[PDB]
Amino acid sequence: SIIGNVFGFKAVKALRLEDMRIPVAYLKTFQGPATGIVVERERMDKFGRPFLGATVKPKLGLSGKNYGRVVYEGLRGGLDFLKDDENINSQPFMRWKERFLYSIEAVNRSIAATGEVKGH
Amino acid sequence: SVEERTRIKNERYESGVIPYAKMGYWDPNYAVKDTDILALFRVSPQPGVDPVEASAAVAGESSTATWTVVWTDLLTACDLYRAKAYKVESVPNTSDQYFAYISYDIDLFEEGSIANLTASIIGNVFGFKAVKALRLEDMRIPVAYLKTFQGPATGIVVERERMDKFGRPFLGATVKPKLGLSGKNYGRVVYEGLRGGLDFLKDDENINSQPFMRWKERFLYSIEAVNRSIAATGEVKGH
Amino acid sequence: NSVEERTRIKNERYESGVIPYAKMGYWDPNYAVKDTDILALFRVSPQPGVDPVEASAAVAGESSTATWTVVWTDLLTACDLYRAKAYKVESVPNTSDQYFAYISYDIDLFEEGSIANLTASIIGNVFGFKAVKALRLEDMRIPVAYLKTFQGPATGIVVERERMDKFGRPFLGATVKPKLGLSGKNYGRVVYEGLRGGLDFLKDDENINSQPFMRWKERFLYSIEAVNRSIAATGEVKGHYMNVTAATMEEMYERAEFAKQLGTVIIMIDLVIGYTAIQTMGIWARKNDMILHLHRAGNSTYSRQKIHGMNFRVICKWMRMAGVDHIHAGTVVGKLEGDPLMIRGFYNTLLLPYLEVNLPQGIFFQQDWASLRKVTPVASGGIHCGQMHQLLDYLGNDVVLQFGGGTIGHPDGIQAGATANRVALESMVIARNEGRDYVAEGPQILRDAAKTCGPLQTALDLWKDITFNYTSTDTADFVE
Amino acid sequence: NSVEERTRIKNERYESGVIPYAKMGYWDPNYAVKDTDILALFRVSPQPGVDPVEASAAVAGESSTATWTVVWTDLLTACDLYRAKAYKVESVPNTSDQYFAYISYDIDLFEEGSIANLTASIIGNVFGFKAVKALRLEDMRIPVAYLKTFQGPATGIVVERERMDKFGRPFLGATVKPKLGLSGKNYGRVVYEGLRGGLDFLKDDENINSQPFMRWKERFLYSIEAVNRSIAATGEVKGHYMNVTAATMEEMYERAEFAKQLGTVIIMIDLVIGYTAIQTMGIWARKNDMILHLHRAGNSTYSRQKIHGMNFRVICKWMRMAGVDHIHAGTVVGKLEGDPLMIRGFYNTLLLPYLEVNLPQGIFFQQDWASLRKVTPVASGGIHCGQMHQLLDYLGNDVVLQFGGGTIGHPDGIQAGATANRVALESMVIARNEGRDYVAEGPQILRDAAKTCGPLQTALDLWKDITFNYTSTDTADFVE
Amino acid sequence: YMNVTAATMEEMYERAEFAKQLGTVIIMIDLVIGYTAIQTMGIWARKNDMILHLHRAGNSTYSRQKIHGMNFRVICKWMRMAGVDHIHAGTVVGKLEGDPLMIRGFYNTLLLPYLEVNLP
Amino acid sequence: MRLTQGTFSFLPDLTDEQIKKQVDYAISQNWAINIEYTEDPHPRNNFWELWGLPLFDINDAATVMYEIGSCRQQHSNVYIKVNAFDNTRGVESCVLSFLINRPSYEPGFRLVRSEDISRNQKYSFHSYATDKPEGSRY
Ligand SMILES: O=C(O)[C@@](O)(COP(=O)(O)O)[C@H](O)[C@H](O)COP(=O)(O)O
Ligand SMILES: O=C(O)[C@@](O)(COP(=O)(O)O)[C@H](O)[C@H](O)COP(=O)(O)O
Ligand SMILES: [Mg+2]
Ligand SMILES: [Mg+2]
Ligand SMILES: [Mg+2]
Ligand SMILES: [Mg+2]
């Protein structure tokens, strides 16, 4: 409804949706965040500071094994999280399953090394 | 320390910021391969940003680059995976606006995934401070990458065969008002429109399932209307 | 007299009747090959009185769109595009009435990702045509655009080495012997002794599936015990190729799922299950992080004779596309057929990212592999550690050297046999890496290592003069 | 010096080292064949200097329990029982260095109901052995006790005739042409015209699966419309072989289930899908009341050359066991290879409940079929109604005569082509049944029917002198 | 021997699967479940690496009287065929019927790879 | 027991001269070399600790031998290995990995078994060295 067709109308040379008031009665039909920041901090046991993280680089081209290496080094060095780049899905240079397998190895190595909950 | 001694002194992979145009993302002599994905961007750089550096930034940040040098490039076939801005042109009848042609190796992409293709091409580059505006104008999707996608489920040839309607446009109509009609009233409009001569009618884009009409009754009445109109005319019809 | 008679096609090409295939569009010496075309090279032996171009055009026609008489229904299709074209017909060197026929097929003739469909066209009927007394498929150019519709190897050699944590040398393996008759518990005994003694892998024999003398489940259970015993004993990742070959897809899946549940790094399948079950397993192996070894059972029924059948390099291409991680590819010096230059072609077809034309190796087409993963060649059958220099030279670094008889035939036991092979391998690898002329010095390199390895001394004493010198059947038509 | 050295086997047979296969238990000219044994006949061509009995014993050994060197692990098994025995080695008539080797294998060597396992042993490795320059599997005796572990044909010719309500004559069919390029709707057009004009069946071409020019679902949908149109037009049960051949088992099942949902009486599959997918489909067809047609795509890669490969009669046995309902088996007079006596052997292997030895037909073993259902042979490729007398004589009553080009190539249209074939068939059947010498009178029988059948007159005028006279490659070694 | 004997096939499977989940080396069934449930369990036991003990409950209703019924040796053949791993076959000296020569015949029928005619 | 990970572990512990020849080989192939160490000998311990960064574009074997000695000063009581990496497209992986230091005594592994469904078991490789904390293992 709100954005379907009106942005292409000839009679308006430009149109921008700036804000919406979503009423409480409509909001209650949505889940909202699966976890939310409060439960997230409880899962991570990390309170009173920002979380830290890092995107693995280069963006594309790394193998699953090398991905795990970067994840291990970053988490073990002090980061709470690392992450796959947005464009890292499954590709000729690295298929997704080996990345997940090496990443959880790296995560659990870092947890044992630090005594912190960590994630990728 | 071992860390100090093993620091990379090589100019390109030494730590620090260097321009994207000196990182391998600008190459006006690049030989485009028939397997490359190509993109054409309309690039409006910020004042004081050179058009080539902006285009190299787009190339870099939609392929393999980040804002500072990383040694981990050297674990990959980085020369192959870097996208290359290979031609920049001024746009006719504009100031400070450029066409940038960028090439991406086929191995950068997940086979058959629009999400992955778009995650690279449009993921982050439209928000870069250094460009005040950016538009993706066209892409060359190579045959080798196209073959990993289904293409249309039916396609117009099979569609015409299913409808038994050749040599003319199809006709349709969106049911109105857009919202508020009941299922039974929806079916009425569908029947009258098809029976009077239209090939199709359609639900409005915002007609899904709502307090004024739930989806199942709409579908049930719509198919009654369709089949009434088929019997009345001898044509295949649809809603 | 009727409307059917009245609307008959008067056009000479599409009027009813028989006309030569070479005048039906299937011969075009001026055809411009497209980069999306599938190309095939056939070795064509026409019957007496049959013209070489006509025989070649018949193969082209009956593997694409033609039949034996003209059909008007051609005209309902873009027939000029769909007809395959024999575009080059050459005399084979040193033959009287034998020809190389190069044939082009449009990419749209083929089902995406289907070895069954590709082969249905290329090999379906043309080998049985009366008019050619023999026909062999020698090579194919699979274009990048068609290759991208296939998975390629589930694992590939790069990921395989990473899973095994083994780099810079061949893998070692061994088939359990005797071929048939062992119980599950005895199978596990052999696997434990071989792995614990130095082998990276052992394997079920190709004909070991599930039988009265041993049912499959106990074999898998004892085998994983043996594997895990050997891992704990050595600190190496080890594996045993559990053979999931079976009569039906449901049974193969049951066996593969059980092997997966036990945690094997590797399973095997036999070529006799056929292309569709193989492709199904290739996909399963990718989905389930499994190394998939292909034994080439039955391949030599069509691959042995130079004048007729299919050269193994084509099978290498189809199985790489299908998603296997290993395939048997020859030894040169063992008990099975293997000309060194043909074998070099096979290994390169399996392992390289790109192949240039190399007529002495039987590589007739430039082949881009489209970044599909690499198949690990497997050298197996009648080899022994006294040949290690020859194996490293002929076969290279990226291979599984399998010693069945050459491990289990060792007079001091299975562990000793494994140890002999492992020491022989490492001794030869280190010598090669140091820059030594290890082919000339190979026998002495092995003797030197034997000075501090009793098992190797014994193996050299027993087998050093065992050779399998016979004239090859499958040989090149060109030399360097 | 050690406990391993101390406990070495001193026994001459089981001490380490290489000994001839003929001294390892694999040659026994006094072996008493058991009625449960699997027997194989191989045509063996040894390399120069290799003894014929030793070559035969090597084949026996490497297709059962042996490897190239002695292994102590033999003694963990009932090895005297599990070793295969070459028991008769004979010179092939009219050859210099070629032998018939009869080999016996115990029933316990094999997995029950598995073509993959049977073939893994019999054809797995032995065709690639350096020591034999050629090898062909000619025949096998599959014992009743092993046959009872297989389904046999899902439907079989008896139930097939009952479903079709068609008795006392061959079935008729036709492959749709051109081979590739037609759309789904055009496919349906051809099927409607052919069935409505008189054919019992039409079929997808072997290479028609799912492609850019036509996806499979529309073809099946239009095909069943065409079938049901033709049934309503004629009052006969009709069918179209919907080809469910695909890359994976899941895709084949999706296609077979859809065909089932549409109500087809019949589907087809290609031999290139391989043995495990074929067995899986045989079981599916029995479960789902479906006639399962097997096209033999790729068979001629190994079946054409007399000195090497597998004779088609063995494939007939394996596919009958596997559960197919039709298989292509030759025409004699058409465009594909087919010696009449070899073809007679193939047809008898597929259709008879019991075969006696018949050396002129290439039937080397007495074969009890254990009441497994019968496979309908299919005669296809380059045949026409002018040959109807020859087809009825060479091929008999129990067959599908398929006329692709011979229907669709008719100048007055597809219906006319079908009508010509149907009238020609019935005219020849009625003449045979009346006791007439229909082979001598055949051309006149066809001319007489043509007097009141324009379509047949035209077909005879167009094709009557079309012949395919070439020397056969696959021929007998004995004559009557 | 966990007894999975039950009224319906579904209940028997539930009990056999639970026994399997617990890791028992062995289960039992009673002959009174009947031939089709027995064959079903014999196949299940092969599929699930389970020793399947058959108790011969009810066998003596037809096996006791020399002039009428079925001699137990026939039941031995059918149950061996059906897939059971144990069957009760007599003690000679215990509380149940068991002539020594008949019992030898039963045991030989269950255990031997081949039996010659042996009238005694 | 002897840990037989690495390309040459069925041969005696390599001399410095043997190691230098393997380094020369790697250099001649333009492979990157690095040095790693560990006190967890588990066969699936994928990430041994890094000794600095990998050495890329190496001309001189003596630079690698220097770092080998330097790593040994800190870690010769535990495992040290040398790896070579090839970033050619289609490889982009380790192509050589061999052990250059071992502890004087490696106790090896306990094979741990747990009962699972029917006859299936679950297995674990327990390193005896890891019975003690890092720094106290070897
Ligand atoms: O059955 C056999 O003979 C083997 O197990 C080898 O045993 P040995 O190691 O005891 O010889 C292999 O399957 C063959 O090597 C296959 O041949 P290829 O590799 O040519 O396909
Ligand atoms: O593709 C073809 O050539 C056919 O459709 C015949 O077409 P025509 O009827 O137009 O000749 C058949 O598949 C062959 O007969 C198969 O050979 P076989 O039966 O020997 O396996
Ligand atoms: Mg990112
Ligand atoms: Mg709308
Ligand atoms: Mg084998
Ligand atoms: Mg065909």
PDB file of N, CA and C in Angstrom, chain E residues 45-46 50-54 79 83-87:
ATOM      1  N   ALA E  45      15.248 -55.810  12.741  1.00  0.00           N
ATOM      2  CA  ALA E  45      16.429 -56.208  13.497  1.00  0.00           C
ATOM      3  C   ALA E  45      17.696 -56.189  12.633  1.00  0.00           C
ATOM      4  N   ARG E  46      17.574 -56.593  11.370  1.00  0.00           N
ATOM      5  CA  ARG E  46      18.687 -56.523  10.409  1.00  0.00           C
ATOM      6  C   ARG E  46      19.038 -55.073  10.127  1.00  0.00           C
ATOM      7  N   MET E  50      20.284 -55.379  15.740  1.00  0.00           N
ATOM      8  CA  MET E  50      19.696 -55.863  16.976  1.00  0.00           C
ATOM      9  C   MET E  50      19.617 -57.381  16.966  1.00  0.00           C
ATOM     10  N   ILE E  51      20.005 -58.009  18.079  1.00  0.00           N
ATOM     11  CA  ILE E  51      19.763 -59.437  18.266  1.00  0.00           C
ATOM     12  C   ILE E  51      18.269 -59.582  18.605  1.00  0.00           C
ATOM     13  N   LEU E  52      17.579 -60.439  17.857  1.00  0.00           N
ATOM     14  CA  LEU E  52      16.145 -60.665  18.016  1.00  0.00           C
ATOM     15  C   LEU E  52      15.842 -62.050  18.579  1.00  0.00           C
ATOM     16  N   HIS E  53      15.477 -62.102  19.856  1.00  0.00           N
ATOM     17  CA  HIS E  53      15.147 -63.365  20.510  1.00  0.00           C
ATOM     18  C   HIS E  53      13.662 -63.684  20.341  1.00  0.00           C
ATOM     19  N   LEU E  54      13.348 -64.876  19.831  1.00  0.00           N
ATOM     20  CA  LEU E  54      11.964 -65.354  19.747  1.00  0.00           C
ATOM     21  C   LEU E  54      11.634 -66.324  20.882  1.00  0.00           C
ATOM     22  N   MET E  79      10.882 -69.967  11.221  1.00  0.00           N
ATOM     23  CA  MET E  79      11.394 -68.857  12.038  1.00  0.00           C
ATOM     24  C   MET E  79      12.834 -68.486  11.683  1.00  0.00           C
ATOM     25  N   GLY E  83      13.758 -64.595  10.174  1.00  0.00           N
ATOM     26  CA  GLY E  83      14.786 -63.667  10.628  1.00  0.00           C
ATOM     27  C   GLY E  83      15.070 -63.558  12.110  1.00  0.00           C
ATOM     28  N   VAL E  84      14.583 -64.510  12.907  1.00  0.00           N
ATOM     29  CA  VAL E  84      14.846 -64.478  14.349  1.00  0.00           C
ATOM     30  C   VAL E  84      16.261 -64.993  14.599  1.00  0.00           C
ATOM     31  N   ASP E  85      16.860 -64.527  15.691  1.00  0.00           N
ATOM     32  CA  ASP E  85      18.247 -64.855  16.033  1.00  0.00           C
ATOM     33  C   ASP E  85      18.396 -65.925  17.102  1.00  0.00           C
ATOM     34  N   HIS E  86      17.429 -65.993  18.011  1.00  0.00           N
ATOM     35  CA  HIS E  86      17.296 -67.084  18.972  1.00  0.00           C
ATOM     36  C   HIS E  86      15.910 -67.691  18.807  1.00  0.00           C
ATOM     37  N   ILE E  87      15.787 -68.966  19.143  1.00  0.00           N
ATOM     38  CA  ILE E  87      14.488 -69.543  19.451  1.00  0.00           C
ATOM     39  C   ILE E  87      14.648 -70.603  20.532  1.00  0.00           C
TER      40      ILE E  87
END
